[PDB]
């Protein structure tokens, strides 16, 4: 498994503000078939290569796809503090996972 996934790391944003969760896979030519964005174990949205973005109903109002394979979380609350993952499904390499840790300051 040759590729590496880079993320935005440890980031803070203000309550009621927004945040771009971003990841970038590199060092591989495998096709990214889909990307899942997760708040801990809780799916936020998927971005499938053929069918584009699909958002969890529970987050539909406060999520905007992108930029790119990134995701934008809106109307942050203190409960949005924690870890987020970007799961890349690739062929043939398989799964690459990234982590981002967000602090929502009050």
- For 35, the token pair is 């990307």
Per DSSP, the three-state class of 80 is helix
Between 67 and 82, name the residue whose CB sits nearer to a second copy: 67
| Residue 94 binds: one of Cl ion, a second copy, none (C-beta under 5 to 8 A by kind) | none
The stretch near a second copy (CB under 8 A) out of 32-40, 51-59, 62-70, 89-97 is 62-70
The only residue of 9, 68, 82, 94 in contact with Cl ion, by rule CB under 5 A: 68
The only residue of 16, 67, 82, 94 in contact with a second copy, by rule CB under 8 A: 67
Q: Report strand pairing: 52-55 vs 42-48.
A: antiparallel
């Amino acid at each position: 498994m040759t590729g590496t996934i880079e993320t935005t790391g440890n980031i803070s944003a203000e309550k009621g503000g927004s945040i771009i969760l971003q990841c970038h896979l590199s060092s591989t030519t495998a096709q990214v078939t889909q990307v899942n964005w997760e708040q801990q174990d809780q799916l936020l949205a998927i971005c499938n290569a053929d069918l584009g973005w699909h958002i969890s109903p529970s987050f539909k109002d406060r999520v905007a796809p992108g930029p790119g394979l990134g995701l934008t979380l809106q109307s942050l609350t203190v409960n949005d503090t924690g870890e987020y993952f970007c799961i890349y499904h690739t062929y043939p390499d398989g799964t690459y996972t990234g982590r981002i840790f967000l602090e929502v300051l009050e």
